[PDB]
Write a protein that binds this ligand. Structure first.
Ligand SMILES: O=C(O)c1c(Cn2cccn2)ccc2c1OB(O)CO2
Length: 242
């Protein structure tokens, strides 16, 4: 069920980095990680919370489909991609916080709390500001717990409609070619220590699917590219991608 492979530490070492990668082989039902303790510690989800928050908003009508437009409110913010109109697709891709804060207001916390207990998401706790608990409130989740939630979403087993789950999976699309497909979501948590980055999702092959969840220390914005680079080094060492 779970094996530790400390050879993968070489990939964090050679980049002067600390973190964890967790993998799950769905055909064989086997899990793998470089550090079993950190794999099972809880952190703020940050922008990886955009997956469940999308699901809830669609199932309630706040978002009607993936073409509906959320136009720029005219307030200039330090991230430049955020100062333009978006839909569900581009708002996931550029991690556009103020679009999703507006959703959370619309949903309100009786219904947000209800959906998270139904989802069995993390510690299920939404203490703090209705529109920022995932960035500086009481909600926490581990890498192994990210994997269990994502497996339900892959199999359409969450207690929302099939249509909602299909639309969110479309909007998670990150990479594809003749060898693999990746559906995933980035996160960057900087408001409460420790600053960390996330990348969670899966790799679809012709005949199997490998779920993944990673996080790593991130004192400076300069190492954000390492989230994907280290993850792909593990995948290649294990012969999952070329
Ligand atoms: O890593 C994030 O997703 C991300 C980034 C960087 N980034 C966006 C797309 C790829 N990288 C910047 C700000 C931010 C972010 O997520 B959240 O946790 C909210 O704020």
């Amino acid at each position: 069920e779970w094996q530790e492979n400390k050879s993968w530490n070489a990939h964090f070492t050679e980049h002067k980095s600390q973190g964890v990668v967790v993998l799950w082989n769905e055909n064989k039902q086997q899990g793998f990680t470089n550090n079993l303790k950190r794999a099972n510690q809880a952190f703020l989800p940050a922008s990886t919370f955009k997956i469940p928050n999308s699901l809830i908003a669609l199932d309630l009508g706040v978002v009607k489909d993936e073409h509906q437009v959320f136009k720029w409110d005219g307030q200039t913010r330090d991230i430049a991609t955020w100062n333009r109109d978006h839909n569900l697709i581009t708002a996931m891709k550029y991690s556009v916080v103020p679009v999703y804060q507006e959703f959370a207001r619309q949903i309100g916390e009786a219904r947000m709390s209800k959906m998270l207990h139904a989802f069995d998401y993390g510690n299920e706790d939404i203490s703090g500001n209705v529109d920022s608990f995932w960035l500086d409130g009481g909600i926490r989740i581990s890498a192994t717990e990210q994997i269990s939630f994502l497996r339900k979403l892959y199999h359409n087993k969450l207690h929302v409609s099939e249509r909602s789950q299909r639309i969110v999976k479309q909007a998670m699309l990150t990479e594809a070619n003749g060898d693999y497909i990746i559906r995933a979501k980035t996160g960057y948590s900087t408001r409460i220590e420790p600053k960390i980055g996330w990348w969670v999702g899966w790799v679809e092959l012709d005949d199997n699917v490998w779920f993944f969840a990673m996080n790593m220390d991130m004192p400076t914005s300069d190492g954000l590219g390492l989230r994907q680079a280290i993850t792909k080094e593990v995948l290649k060492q294990e012969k999952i991608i070329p």
